[PDB]
């Protein structure tokens, strides 16, 4: 029963291993093994549930174990394993073949097979752990082993993509352990984790690997947000080491998602408004990407309210995600109408929902945006309006309070008006008629630049996928 | 079946003239008993859930209707199933003779045509659409193909189907060659005009409703006074003052409606007050029309008060171009408008750039801004140009 179960899944694993083994042996091809590893995550996740855990036991017995003898026993100890007589030395799939990792030349140490075998061995370990959701000692045991192993290897061009997906599980398993239980050792463990990310990122700068630095920057920028150091994130993004060429669309959307949150506290919403929009277009619309589109759209609605301009309300009702957008619907209504008591009562009941995403602190500063937007609305109504009539519509305190708020927004060019005290009304200084000025000409220049940029980007990849058609013999 | 859907909607939510619910409830009870539809007597329970003026009294004592019992029972249900099983026995007896004969493609399709009418009159929706697809492929010409669309449009107007009905609507239109066919024109312009209602297109609504071939009046779906009802409502948006004195006021089809149906009054009180641009007479006719037109109609009351905001926007633009500087108290004693409530009425437009009115709060006078310029027109190209570049970058990066 259990004998035929281990031979079926192991044969499917070796079949996928021999495909990427011959591709890296001849010259250097990094494109083909990368496309297979994309589907490997989905095929292995479903396969780990079937045929239990016994598919990975004979794989370690097959190939030679540099470090991997005692690591599988520690993984099988937590599950209280019953003895099936799985002791190594029973099943032998090598049988002295060149593609089978010939044993005599391997045992004599005349050839080194450990490079591709050991780096691939650590990949299947983190996949089974993420399926069973194992924590505590098993998480710390892997972090201690992997770090010296990556420092010993020279990390060639093909070797940089093997551990590129392993760093994601290092930071993921550390955050799930802290949120599950808080202790004194969780803080000291994060100190070493910060130094490990920076040492490997600096080494990857010489190799100039596109996917390696893409996964690290996404994990490092998120670490600064949890640890709460802004000065580290400000200088980190100033170097601009993130390549835009071969990185995946899923990795690009995560990059622009962090820049919108960093610039949110810098009081510059001009550049932050573009990063949150570009992150939506780069993120897929599929079901697995719904988790990112849910959090990204919650930030976009908050940025527009911080800009003093009411965004388009059609995004809430037309989308199918409005169930989670209900708290943000009443926030825009309170800022637009300018009701003072409605805004205070909205953030009070929904404070629990806004605590998880940490957007409640930004809602505290929306209290100012309620009045600043209302002043902009009433200013665009009538060019000449009395001073005391403003306090009657918004139910303000006195005329001395509104006098400062109108002259406050004109510093950034918001209201664009003047207050006449001797006359008794506030006259708007905006006559429009910009058709005679040069201001629209500056915007028209940047629009054509976007056209010539896409034309050059159209030339980036055109003939490239067709380059292999001429060299390969056709009919 | 126009009164079937009309009286059923009057029992949903009615805030004006609750006496109409009695004639509506007594009609739907006597209509279902005289027809073969089983489930439409049962649908009264689910369709009226969570609505003002509940027509059902079981656990909810807040029902304001005159007839408070729509409750479904097995006494009427069993009687309607007997008429359904007795009729299908006669049709299956004829269909069995047609299957053994199989004379031409018309008799083979007529078997499904009798079913397409049967499954539509027994209360089946998806089961009727499956029978209409068989008769569509067996039709010998376009004459039997459009009759399939008539049943599709019948079940689509009751359940508000904007997808399957709209797709089959343009399918009969395109086909191979359209031509000047009366059936593919008169019926299409009326039905497609009804689909433009719910989505509020207003571009084709004025052309396909205010302008009709003659009377329409199929009596099966919508009636004569209904087409003229939506014509007065939709004719106040796209049609400007040039067409109001031609296809509205001077239209010969609307001249005999005043002396025929006096319950509408949307082609006289609304048209004369707007053509004369008199706010004094135009104001009291808003609520009189809102009660007897927008509320009873199914495709109107869904929006309702939004139309009041849009219809009042038209008269504000008529007066704005008639003067530059005017006092606020001048229109108060003349057109009968409240000065204190005037700022709140105009406050829903001016900040949204819907109107150019500017009122001075010092001396209490209203001014006029520039109605049109080159700068305001280029702003539409900015939003249209930036919205277009999104698809170029989205579809450009998706294909690689």
């Amino acid at each position: 029963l259990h004998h035929s179960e281990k031979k079926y899944a192991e044969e499917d694993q070796v079949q996928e291993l021999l495909k990427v083994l011959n591709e890296i042996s001849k010259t250097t091809l990094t494109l083909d093994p990368r496309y297979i590893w994309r589907s490997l995550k989905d095929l292995s996740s479903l396969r780990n549930q079937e045929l239990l855990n016994a598919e990975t036991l004979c794989f370690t017995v097959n190939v030679l174990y540099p470090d991997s003898s005692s690591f599988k026993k520690n993984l099988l100890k937590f599950i209280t394993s019953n003895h099936k007589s799985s002791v190594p030395g029973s099943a032998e799939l090598r049988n002295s073949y060149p593609a089978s990792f010939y044993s005599v030349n391997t045992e004599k140490k005349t050839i080194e097979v450990t490079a591709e075998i050991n780096c691939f061995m650590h990949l299947l370990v983190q996949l089974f752990l993420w399926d069973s959701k194992e924590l505590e000692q098993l998480v710390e045991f892997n972090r201690k082993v992997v770090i010296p192993n990556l420092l010993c290897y020279y990390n060639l061009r093909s070797l940089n993509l093997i551990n590129a997906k392993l760093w994601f599980y290092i930071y993921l398993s550390h955050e799930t352990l802290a949120r599950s239980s808080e202790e004194i050792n969780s803080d000291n463990q994060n100190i070493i984790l910060r130094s490990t990310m920076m040492k490997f990122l600096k080494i990857a700068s010489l190799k100039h690997d596109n996917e390696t630095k893409a996964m690290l920057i996404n994990l490092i920028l998120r670490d600064f947000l949890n640890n709460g150091e802004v000065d580290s994130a400000s200088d980190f993004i100033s170097k601009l080491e993130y390549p835009h060429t071969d990185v995946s669309s899923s990795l690009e959307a995560r990059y622009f998602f962090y820049l919108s949150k960093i610039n949110a506290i810098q009081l510059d919403y001009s550049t932050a408004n573009e990063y949150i929009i570009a992150a939506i277009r780069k993120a897929p619309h599929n079901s697995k990407s719904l988790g990112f589109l849910q959090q990204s759209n919650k930030l976009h609605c908050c940025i527009q309210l911080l800009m003093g301009d009411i965004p388009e309300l059609s995004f809430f009702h037309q989308s199918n995600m409005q169930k989670s957008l209900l708290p943000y619907y009443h926030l825009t209504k309170a800022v637009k109408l300018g009701d003072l008591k409605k805004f205070t009562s909205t953030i009070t009941k929904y404070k629990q929902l806004l605590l998880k995403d940490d957007t409640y602190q930004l809602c505290v500063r929306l209290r100012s945006n309620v009045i600043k937007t209302g002043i902009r609305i009433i200013s665009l109504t009538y060019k000449k309006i009395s001073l005391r009539d403003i306090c009657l519509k918004l139910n303000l305190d006195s005329e001395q309070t509104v006098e400062y708020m109108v002259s406050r927004a004109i510093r950034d060019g918001v209201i664009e008006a003047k207050i006449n005290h001797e006359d008794g009304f506030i006259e708007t200084t905006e006559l429009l008629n910009i058709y005679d000025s040069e201001d629209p000409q500056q915007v028209f220049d940047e629009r054509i630049k976007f056209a010539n940029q896409l034309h050059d980007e159209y030339l980036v990849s055109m003939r490239y996928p067709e380059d292999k058609k001429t060299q390969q013999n056709e009919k | 079946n126009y009164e079937v859907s009309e009286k059923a909607f009057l029992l949903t939510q009615s805030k004006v003239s609750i006496e109409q619910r009695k004639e509506a409830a007594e009609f739907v009870l006597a209509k279902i008993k005289e027809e073969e539809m089983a489930p439409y007597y049962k649908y009264l329970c689910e369709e009226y859930l969570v609505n003002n003026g509940q027509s059902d009294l079981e656990h909810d004592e807040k029902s304001d209707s005159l007839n408070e019992w729509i409750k479904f029972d097995q006494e009427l249900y069993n009687e309607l199933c007997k008429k359904n099983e007795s009729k299908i026995k006669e049709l299956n007896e004829k269909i069995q003779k047609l299957e053994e004969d199989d004379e031409g493609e018309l008799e083979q399709a007529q078997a499904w045509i009798n079913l397409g009418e049967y499954y539509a009159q027994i209360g089946d929706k998806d089961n009727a659409e499956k029978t209409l697809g068989k008769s569509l492929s067996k039709a010998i010409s376009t004459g039997a193909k459009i009759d399939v669309m008539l049943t599709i449009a019948r079940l689509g107007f009751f359940y508000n189907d904007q997808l399957y009905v709209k797709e089959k609507l343009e399918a009969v239109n395109s086909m191979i060659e359209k031509g000047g066919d009366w059936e593919r024109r008169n019926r299409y312009k009326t039905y497609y005009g009804i689909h433009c209602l719910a989505v509020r297109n207003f571009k084709e609504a004025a052309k396909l409703l205010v302008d009709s071939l003659a009377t329409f009046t199929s009596i099966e779906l919508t009636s004569y006074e209904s087409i003229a009802t939506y014509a007065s409502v939709t004719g106040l948006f796209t049609l400007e003052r040039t067409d109001l004195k031609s296809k509205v006021i001077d239209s010969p089809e609307l001249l005999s409606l005043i002396s025929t149906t006096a319950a509408l009054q949307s082609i006289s009180s609304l048209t004369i007050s707007l053509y004369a641009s008199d706010y004094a007479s135009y104001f009291p006719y808003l609520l009189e029309t809102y009660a007897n037109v927008l509320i009873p109609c199914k495709y109107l009351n869904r929006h309702a008060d939004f139309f009041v905001r849009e219809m009042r926007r038209k008269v504000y633009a008529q007066l704005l171009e008639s003067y530059k500087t005017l006092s606020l108290k001048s229109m108060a004693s003349a057109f009968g408008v409240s000065v204190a409530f005037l700022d709140n009425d105009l406050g829903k437009f001016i900040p949204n750039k819907q109107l150019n009115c500017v009122i001075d709060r010092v001396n209490g006078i209203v001014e006029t801004n520039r109605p049109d310029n080159k700068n305001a027109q280029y702003h539409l190209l900015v939003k249209q140009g930036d919205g277009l570049l999104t698809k170029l970058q989205k579809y450009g990066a998706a294909v690689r």
Partner: peptide, 27 residues
Amino acid sequence: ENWDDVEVDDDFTNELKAELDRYKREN
């Protein structure tokens, strides 16, 4: 639809008749 296409106003509905009443009384 959104903005004022749905919420509209929800105020001054039945109070429109009170505007003509106060004009014919306080006059």
